[PDB]
Amino acid sequence: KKTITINGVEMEASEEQTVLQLLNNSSIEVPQVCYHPSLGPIETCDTCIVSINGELKRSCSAELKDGDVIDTLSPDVKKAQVIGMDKILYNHELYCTVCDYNNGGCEIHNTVKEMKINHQSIPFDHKPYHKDESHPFYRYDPDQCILCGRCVEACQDVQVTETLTIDWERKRPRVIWDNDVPINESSCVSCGHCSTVCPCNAMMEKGMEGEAGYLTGINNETLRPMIEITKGVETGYGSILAISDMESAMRDERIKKTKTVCTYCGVGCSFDVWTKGRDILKVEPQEEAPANGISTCVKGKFGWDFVNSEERLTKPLIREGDHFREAEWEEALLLIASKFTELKEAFGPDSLAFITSSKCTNEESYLMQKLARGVIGTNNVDNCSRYCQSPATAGLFRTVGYGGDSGSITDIAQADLVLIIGSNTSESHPVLSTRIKRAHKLRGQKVIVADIRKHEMAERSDLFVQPRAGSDIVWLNAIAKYLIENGKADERFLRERVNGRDEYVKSLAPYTLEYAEEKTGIDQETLIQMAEMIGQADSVCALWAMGVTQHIGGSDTSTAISNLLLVTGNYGKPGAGSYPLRGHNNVQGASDFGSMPDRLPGYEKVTDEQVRQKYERVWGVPLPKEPGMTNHEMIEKIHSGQLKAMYVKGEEMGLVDSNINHVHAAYEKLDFFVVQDIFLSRTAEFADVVLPASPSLEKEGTFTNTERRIQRLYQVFEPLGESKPDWQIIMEVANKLGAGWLYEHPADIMEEAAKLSPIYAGVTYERLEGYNSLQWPVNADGKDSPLLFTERFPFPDGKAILYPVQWTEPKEFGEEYDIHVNNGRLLEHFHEGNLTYKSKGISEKTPEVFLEISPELAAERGIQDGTLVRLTSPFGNVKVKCLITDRVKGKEVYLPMNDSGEAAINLLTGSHADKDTDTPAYKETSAKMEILKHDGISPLPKINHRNGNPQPQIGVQVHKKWARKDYIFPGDAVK
């Protein structure tokens, strides 16, 4: 439809709105410098001038109206594009041969080569501004800035950090952070969008700077004169452009660009990691990345210094006396195998419990569970999901039947309303929050953030309401009652794909709007208006992170949320559904491959005859009928003497579990302990033998992110020292246990698990090549399911069931535990920071843990900033610094987990867990407030991103540039 003619030849139009998309699909060589597919039309480079309807206009923003005439080889359009690129090069020095970004992907270089230009009519003029190297990760070079606005559009529209603007009013326009604050002192999240989206080397990572190529490591005092020499020597750009292409080929040999998936959080963003030997030069996202595309956070794009950190354990460590001796691989393997055989043939395999890391690949968790069941014969396996996703998955089983998100992050963006409850998506799953904020700022989607704290998203939400600690169930079920009672609920969906509507309504009888108003401490008007919005919203996406699921009734309120969507009728609809925020990069993958003790790989319960018979046939070893014990209850079993040995890999559970005094006592109580961590973590300190893990960069596997996407990794580095990828270590351990495993590369493990797992039936390494990713469930034909519950639910009847649940009383200690401290995670730091702390930049941004305290409570208790304070709970006693901010309200305070010493929050939390899944109630914590030091150094430096003031504007605001008298449009300049 919408017939068009381009280049004098008839062509058809597609859903694309602008001429530039059609030209790209038609492979017309139209210069497009300022256009990025994810960014959208920025219209600031004017090199995309084409003749639409005869008039010269920007093809990047020219609407593809029916019947228009398109010409691109005309002398007029060629002259306009040449003038535009000359204006661009007036702002770009263009020293391609000695420029780090000339890895062949630089749009100025490519476009300049494509136009076959040889001269710039306007000579290059250095801007008066100096390079801004304040940031420890990426620098900005206003001399090389071409003012294309891609970085500003990224920071304002696709990442919505809003730290970047452009001072068009200035005599020399440039990119400015906040109000021209230096970069470090500004509100820059350090997400890396500006660096990734920059066409030129204007906004480029300091890792590349002076390290990308061969001639770019030359000192600036002796590189700049060479640049001036070449400027004054070459007459045509063609020859030196060819020389720069040779230098790009130069870089190609030394620069290794391998795809990987970020290990930190469950968004599972995939990107190439441009390295030079062992150091990491750049983290370059690609538009083809499924989970993020170009989107990235500070962790995944500047947090990989832990791989090359000297603290990394290169050799196996054995607990010799009172020290850790650096022992050989073979002797450590023999020791662990002999000890495991001893405690297996003495007290039985049931007294053996092993933990896989949710940070490791699917092959890793599958190998853990196989070693437990197909080798040891026990079922005691778990991961962080016991603390993270056990109640969410339990609720999904109880209502929908499938664990994981209902769809992809693209479906999150496509939603009309996002119901985020207990989620610090801005600081925990950053890229998903960028998608949500992009849809809110641009697509007009309204979101309802419901959490006690006021994070970045809460202050940027359509309706932010803070309920009481764990009181999400009350107001949520009241909202569901109102929706189902006033007729706004989708009754057709209820009759079609839902069961037990009247039973759920009977369960909702005691729940009233005033009841929720009293319980949650929230006014009735906000609840009624958000319920009206939910009823009116066509598509609803409900995200619930640990703020709600990590509670005594966390499973109950997870079922409540899921059946709330069920009543609303969002499952199966494109762009709407339940998206429990999977925390670790592969916590979803670990749970998929039988990490939880009650289920096998394929998300099948262990107490099923058919699956047990199939796993016996494939493995050759009988399956333990007795379900394994939960991770949290393991410590109590140890204190009762039931458990004696642990094999926990890549999980520092001695510091992240509730009441870490209790896990410390259990650790000192148990006999044999083997841990598998890249760094000498807190758990690694208490271990009879330490096995040197390998980070996901140095190992190949498959990461299953929150969107139930299984994306294959690549071996970025050979493992440091002689340490091995965790799958290799597990294979060696099992072989020393008489397993007989033969897996040369993890593809065999992946295909074996695919055969075993009904949900993973179709995932294979040849189907996961490059950036291709499959979202479980996948059938044997290889066709995945991007949206869950699209046609039918997994239940035998094909229709989901509403689960009757009530408000489970939070285990608040009561009495002297007045102040209710809240525990979470910061954006820059990852849990205790076994990885981020090893990166110098993140340490500079956030050096130490802090206790965020409310201004109201700063008056009655008389507390100030930079003060060391004491928090005491029947399970711990921490000494943490203090921070003054309005993010927290009243007594409730925020204590991020970004310290691993005496200041870790996990001392205060107790051994009270959920009824359904025994998930510790980390969010249910209370303590004292003791003032130790009145005057001290503020834990949050001025260079932290929370101290800045972002400028919220939509787009690059080009209209300000167009209002400048000096600016002239090339289309009417050629005239």
Ligand X SMILES: *SC1=C(S)[C@@H]2Nc3c(nc(N)[nH]c3=O)N[C@@H]2O[C@@H]1COP(=O)(O)OP(=O)(O)OC[C@H]1O[C@@H](n2cnc3c(=O)[nH]c(N)nc32)[C@H](O)[C@@H]1O
Ligand Y SMILES: CCCCCCCCCCCCCCCCCC(=O)OC[C@H](COP(=O)(O)OC[C@H](O)CO)OC(=O)CCCCCCCCCCCCCCC
Annotated binding residues for [4Fe-4S] cluster, written as ranges, equal 92, 96, 99, 106, 145, 148, 151, 155, 188, 191, 194, 198, 262, 265, 269, 297
Beta bridge partners of 2: none
User: 356 or 520, CB closer to ligand H2S?
Assistant: 356
Rounded Cα gap, residues 506 and 503, in angstroms: 5
Interface segment toward ligand X; rule CB under 6 A; list 208-216, 446-454, 488-496, 743-751: 446-454
Interface segment toward ligand FES; rule CB under 6 A; list 26-34, 97-105, 712-720, 830-838: 26-34
**Residue 735 sits in the site that holds ligand Y (CB under 6 A):** no
Residues making up the binding site for [2Fe-2S] cluster: 34, 45, 48, 60
Residues making contact with other proteins (CB under 8 A): 218-219, 221-223, 225-226, 228-229, 231-235
The 385-404 site mask, x for binding Mo ion (CB under 5 A), equals: ---x----------------
Tokens standing for residue 245 = 């292409």
Among 384, 418, 606, 753, binds Mo ion (CB under 5 A): 384
Pick from 180, 337, 217, 297: which is nearest to 731 by CA? Answer: 337
The 864-893 site mask, x for binding Mo ion (CB under 5 A), equals: ------------------------------
- Amino acid making up residue 374: G
Question: Which residues, at least 6 apart from 962, have a Cβ–Cβ distance to it below 8 Å?
Answer: 969
The CB density around residue 155, as the number of other CB atoms within 10 Å, is 27
Closest contact distance (angstroms) between CB of 421 and ligand X is 5
Tally of CA atoms within 13 A in the half-sphere of 613 that contains its CB: 3
Please state the φ and ψ torsions of residue 276, each to the nearest 5 degrees.
-130, 85
94 binds, among ligand H2S, ligand X, ligand MQ7, none (CB under 5 to 8 A by kind): ligand MQ7
User: 202 or 868, CB closer to ligand SF4?
Assistant: 202
Residue nearest to ligand H2S (CB): 384
899 DSSP 8-state letter: -
Residue 16: which H helix or E strand, with range?
A: none
Residue nearest to ligand MQ7 (CB): 97
In angstroms, what CA-CA distances link 178 with 131, 138, 171, 435, 763?
A: 17, 16, 18, 21, 45
Rounded Cα gap, residues 77 and 29, in angstroms: 12
User: 109 or 682, CB closer to ligand Y?
Assistant: 109
CB 354 within 8 A of CB 371: yes
Residue nearest to ligand SF4 (CB): 300
Owner of token pair 């519950």: 789
Rounded Cα gap, residues 954 and 957, in angstroms: 7
**Residue 38 sits in the site that holds ligand X (CB under 6 A):** no
Cis preceding linkage at 786, omega within 30: no
Cα dihedral sign, 602-608-612-613:
negative
Tokens standing for residue 11 = 């062509």
- Convert 226-247 into a string of H (helix), E (strand) and C (coil): HHHHHHHHCCCHHHHHHHHHHH
User: 60 or 768, CB closer to ligand FES?
Assistant: 60
**Residue 656 sits in the site that holds ligand X (CB under 6 A):** yes
Rounded Cα gap, residues 462 and 458, in angstroms: 8
Closest contact distance (angstroms) between CB of 550 and ligand X is 6
Beta bridge partners of 895: 823
Among 162, 416, 592, 832, binds ligand X (CB under 6 A): 832
Interface segment toward ligand FES; rule CB under 6 A; list 31-39, 504-512, 569-577, 621-629: 31-39
Residue nearest to ligand Y (CB): 236
Rounded Cα gap, residues 698 and 716, in angstroms: 5
Pick from 344, 457, 480: which is nearest to 827 by CA? Answer: 457
User: 191 or 360, CB closer to ligand H2S?
Assistant: 360
Phi-psi region for residue 692, left (φ > 0), alpha (ψ -120 to 50) or beta? beta
Residue 968: which H helix or E strand, with range?
A: none
Tokens standing for residue 644 = 């004696």
Phi-psi region for residue 266, left (φ > 0), alpha (ψ -120 to 50) or beta? alpha
**Residue 590 sits in the site that holds Mo ion (CB under 5 A):** no
Rounded Cα gap, residues 471 and 809, in angstroms: 9
Residues 241-260 interacting with ligand Y (rule: CB under 6 A): 242
Please state the φ and ψ torsions of residue 352, each to the nearest 5 degrees.
-115, 130
| Helix axes of 609-619 and 746-756: crossing angle, nearest 10 degrees | 150
Residues making up the binding site: 34, 45, 48, 60, 92, 96, 99, 106, 145, 148, 151, 155, 188, 191, 194, 198, 262, 265, 269, 297
Residues making contact with ligand MQ7 (CB under 6 A): 94-98, 215, 226-227, 230-231, 237, 240-241, 243-244
**Residue 262 sits in the site that holds ligand FES (CB under 6 A):** no
Among 186, 369, 477, 834, binds ligand X (CB under 6 A): 834
Residues making contact with ligand SF4 (CB under 6 A): 92, 94-96, 99, 101-102, 106, 108-109, 140, 145-152, 154-155, 159, 161, 163-164, 175, 188-194, 197-203, 262, 264-265, 267-269, 292, 296-297, 299-301, 430-431
Among 570, 676, 715, 846, binds ligand X (CB under 6 A): 676
- Amino acid making up residue 906: N
Please state the φ and ψ torsions of residue 291, each to the nearest 5 degrees.
-75, -35
**Residue 300 sits in the site that holds Mo ion (CB under 5 A):** no
Q: Which residues of 490-503 are buried (b: 16+ CB within 10 A; e: fewer)?
A: beebbeebbbbbee
How far apart are the two ends of the chain, measured CA to CA in Å? 32
Residues comprising the chain, all counted: 975
User: 144 or 704, CB closer to ligand FES?
Assistant: 144
Closest contact distance (angstroms) between CB of 637 and ligand SF4 is 34
Interface segment toward ligand FES; rule CB under 6 A; list 33-41, 322-330, 394-402, 888-896: 33-41
User: 45 or 204, CB closer to ligand FES?
Assistant: 45
292 binds, among Mo ion, ligand SF4, ligand Y, none (CB under 5 to 8 A by kind): ligand SF4
Binding residues for ligand Y, rule: CB under 6 A, are 118, 226, 229-230, 233-236, 238-240, 242
| Contacts to ligand FES by CB under 6 A | 32-35, 43, 45-48, 58, 60
Interface contacts to ligand X, rule CB under 6 A: 263, 265, 299, 357-360, 384, 387-388, 421-424, 427-429, 450-453, 455, 467, 469-470, 472, 545-548, 550, 581, 583-584, 587, 649-653, 656, 676-679, 681, 693, 695-696, 726, 822-827, 829-832, 834-835, 897, 905-906, 909, 922-923
